Amino acid sequence: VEVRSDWEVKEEMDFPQLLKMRYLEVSEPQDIECCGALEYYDKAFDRITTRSEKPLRSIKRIFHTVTTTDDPVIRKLAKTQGNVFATDAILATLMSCTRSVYSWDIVVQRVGSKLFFDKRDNSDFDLLTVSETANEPPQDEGNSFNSPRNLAMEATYINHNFSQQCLRMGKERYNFPNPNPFVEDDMDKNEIASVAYRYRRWKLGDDIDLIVRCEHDGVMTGANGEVSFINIKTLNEWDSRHCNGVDWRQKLDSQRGAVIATELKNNSYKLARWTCCALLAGSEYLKLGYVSRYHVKDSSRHVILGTQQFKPNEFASQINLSVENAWGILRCVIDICMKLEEGKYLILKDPNKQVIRVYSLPDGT
Amino acid sequence: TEQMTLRGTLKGHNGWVTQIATTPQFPDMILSASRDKTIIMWKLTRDETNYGIPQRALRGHSHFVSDVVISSDGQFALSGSWDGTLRLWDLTTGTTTRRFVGHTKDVLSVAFSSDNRQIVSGSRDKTIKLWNTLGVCKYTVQDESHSEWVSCVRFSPNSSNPIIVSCGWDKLVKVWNLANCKLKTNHIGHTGYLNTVTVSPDGSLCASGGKDGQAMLWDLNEGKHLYTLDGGDIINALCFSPNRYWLCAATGPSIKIWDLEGKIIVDELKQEVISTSSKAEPPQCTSLAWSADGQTLFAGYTDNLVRVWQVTI
Amino acid sequence: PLQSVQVFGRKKTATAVAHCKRGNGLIKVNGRPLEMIEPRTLQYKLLEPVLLLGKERFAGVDIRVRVKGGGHVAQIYAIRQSISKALVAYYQKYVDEASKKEIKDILIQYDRTLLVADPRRCESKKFGGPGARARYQKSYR
Amino acid sequence: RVQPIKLARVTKVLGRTGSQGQCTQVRVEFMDDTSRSIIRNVKGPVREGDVLTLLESEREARRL
Amino acid sequence: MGRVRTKTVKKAARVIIEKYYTRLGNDFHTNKRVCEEIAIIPSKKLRNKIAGYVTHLMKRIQRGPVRG
Amino acid sequence: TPDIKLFGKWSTDDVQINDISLQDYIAVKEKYAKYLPHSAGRYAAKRFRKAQCPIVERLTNSMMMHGRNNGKKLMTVRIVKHAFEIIHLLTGENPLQVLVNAIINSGPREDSTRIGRAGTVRRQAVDVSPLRRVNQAIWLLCTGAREAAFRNIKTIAECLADELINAAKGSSNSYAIKKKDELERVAKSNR
RNA sequence: AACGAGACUCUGGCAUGCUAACUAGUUACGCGACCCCCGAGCGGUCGGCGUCCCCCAACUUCUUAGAGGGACAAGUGGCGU
């Protein structure tokens, strides 16, 4: 994005301001609508060990990362419900804004009494940064493997490939009565991702009704007719020794905790971003996969090293993450936009400073 | 043009592949030996996800299995081992027919005749010896023998006459004719000890190699030194092609496949080039054998794998 | 045609020769059920391979075991170590590689001396102690 | 004191100290600041990469 | 641990490589059996040592020149 | 369940470690869940080798002490099966989560040691390993039940299950949470 | 250059390889006898329980004791001139 000279700032909502604001006693959501289908988990992966390792399959599925206005469910539910609209990834960025180090940007296209939080289709918004919150992140150019871009390419490439490798697409899916509205049912390939899309209810106070997309990635077979919903994400690595990290191959079993502590210093932004999504969903287990480069000079070949299921909420108790804070953040942003008129307003993070703003733009810019 | 693609690689060993052989009766089998003290009989699926699975594993040795060879029927299989004994297998469930008793040291080389009635052995005894299929000694060679270890012996295909090759570490190749058991000739050549020798399918040639790593050519019946070729650092195994006049030479980092008419290298097979240092960055190739189809060839390495290749036009 | 393969296990001089002979189910030890082998608190332990692998691996064999040596405890580990290997050997001989390779990965995961044996036995006492290391008291006055 | 419970992790072990080798010098990374590092004395057997539970980072080690 | 090689090994190891340089491979087992035939080492455990050092020397001799 | 052992009846799933500090020396369920706590007798020949073996087994080991009880590991397992049973009837939980809290609440945060100056006692405050915390916390609570049942009509099983409650919810009626706070009270003074 | 150290001797740990056994066993039947239908069936038979019967049976895994092999810092990654 380019910040123009004719865009009007009202308020600098810096991260010290927003880490104090809060909203208390958020009520239990009720689902507006659930759409899609989920595949079942392979229990064989519970017994993975380092010295009997298994590589990574690259599994391509046709993904949907559709924005708020172009999402037909968010579009039509505007006429029955809500007055703030978003998607799960646009929530997670706003929640975890306080740990950001590089720019993000969302066009809040206010309409009447309502807010469409439209992430752009020419942004790089949903790329997942690697070594971002480090002592000094990679400053390498975009011609290099170990750069901010190529590592985010690497990371985002792998994270959904392993979401489906967890899962048995040749076995029975649980199906919602409403199928996916982002593609037709004349997609008989079953080369859609395992995903279903909860559209859920919240109230932040001040007569606000948030109606936002959330999801799971996989369901795991339980027992006694019960099952365990899971958000799957994947922790990539490129080189240990160029970012003050830990070689997981040497230290996974003994220093299991130190490994996760690495990424509370080097990817702490991404960790709680993933956890925010899991708490937005209400997952039963938060699964992650350990993956690293097969050869540290080859950014294409990777190998699975292990998997570990944590319970997301007791996990949140451990990583010192609380969402009481989080709902005052989103509150404080809505304190700006509601008293303004309709228009494409831009909320972004400054690329060299730690402060977000609300711009008023001449519309269509 | 006839060139090589990397087909696939097999897995199922804890010890270095010592030899591989294949019967032309069943090219869908393939047989292997190794320093995990077992010979593994495979089941070849032609899927490129794998390239084969071990079917059964023949067990019972107290030291390495050096060389292995198939029967002409493919219903028997025979082994030579560094425990000083040989075994005669029944390649249908297991259950050794016979074990051959009598050597004081290792049995390095072994081979199985066309008529299935004569079986030879090279030993660090410094004795070539002949063996009935009943497991007793028709003859023993202890006069005009090698003065050092016996590296490899061969049965020669011929019009009908009995001729067998012998080569030792005394840098000589002796050819023997049965029913007098005399020296047919002595061939002198190669500086450093001899590893291997192999005979043409027509049978009038002996392609020999060793520590020298040079491929000298000899005439079986003319008794003439044809020529010499620089085959690299060391050549551990050799095997002619069944359907061509090529010769495939196994050197450490690469396999060198040579066209003979005219004399030139076709290609050099390179395997995975994975970063390792410094003494043998790839594993040495030690054995190799063609399939009877002549499309595919196999290789023995010291990383416990058998790499496959295929000819592509 | 008769099929019979035998194995043993050891721990601390407790031999347990467990033959796998063709048949169906019915594992025994000393001509008694394994369900009543007598400390009956370690009952889950000798049962562990059978329970974990399923009872459908034990549907082509009658296994009976004879034992000797050791105490009450070490015998339990011996009978477990033998039946684990017995099952394997039956597949190693009459069935293909990929059947038993699978079974090997499962057992050796929670290895607890099922497919291996301790080399540890008692050390020999020397004088000046009641034990091999422990010594009699030393007085200076 | 009135500081809340901190958590900090090992980066490297330095060597053993005390008058019977019972103390261990160690370098630790603050686990919230990746350029901050303090030296500590830690009693128990430690490896590397494990996390401690500091009650303060006012204290700092200099000798046995 | 410990197990630093004595002089009795290092004396004969050098000698055996000088006069039987050709016979050597770089494998343990082959270099063992050669030492067994070109000389007698009166123990078995001693033989397993002298081979291993003969092997370890032969690695370095294929680089620059040794000074021993 | 069919691929991972319970305890003979008690799930090792729905069991968490609620610290990030003390996990990777507390584990019980990664694959380390087994039907019984026992070993073949490998537990230590390296410093790292101690950590791996289960927490439930470690508890059984440190329960048999003081002469007459040594070398009676089977008698010891009787006391542990009753313990979990009593804990479940008495409060109603996954009775392993009780134990995990009881261990984590009993481990010290800071500790003192000795230092020689002027031929007179001076003390210095120092920190403590996670591996030290676990070893200490297992020691302390096992001393409680051993002490109580030395003249009480109550059996050691009853005493031990009571001792894990008062540790799991701090209340200073246990021998552990008392003795924990004594050490830290010293560590404040000389520091 | 020599003595001590080490080397050496004994012992433990690895062999379904080798050698051979009614003063050592196992397996297999031949079995006939006892036992209970305990399971399919009927009690027989098939299966299960030990003992007598065992051979001019088969074998040496278990037991026994001899000859041999195996481990060398050997291979890989760090570190050291």
TrEMBL record, chain F:
It comes from Oryctolagus cuniculus (Rabbit). Component of the small ribosomal subunit. Part of the small subunit (SSU) processome, composed of more than 70 proteins and the RNA chaperone small nucleolar RNA (snoRNA) U3. Belongs to the universal ribosomal protein uS7 family. Component of the small ribosomal subunit. The ribosome is a large ribonucleoprotein complex responsible for the synthesis of proteins in the cell. Part of the small subunit (SSU) processome, first precursor of the small eukaryotic ribosomal subunit. During the assembly of the SSU processome in the nucleolus, many ribosome biogenesis factors, an RNA chaperone and ribosomal proteins associate with the nascent pre-rRNA and work in concert to generate RNA folding, modifications, rearrangements and cleavage as well as targeted degradation of pre-ribosomal RNA by the RNA exosome. This is Small ribosomal subunit protein uS7. PROSITE patterns: RIBOSOMAL_S7. The gene is RPS5. InterPro entries: Ribosomal_uS7, Ribosomal_uS7_CS, Ribosomal_uS7_dom, Ribosomal_uS7_dom_sf, Ribosomal_uS7_euk/arc. GO terms for cellular component: cytosolic small ribosomal subunit; small-subunit processome; synapse. PANTHER family: RIBOSOMAL PROTEIN S7.
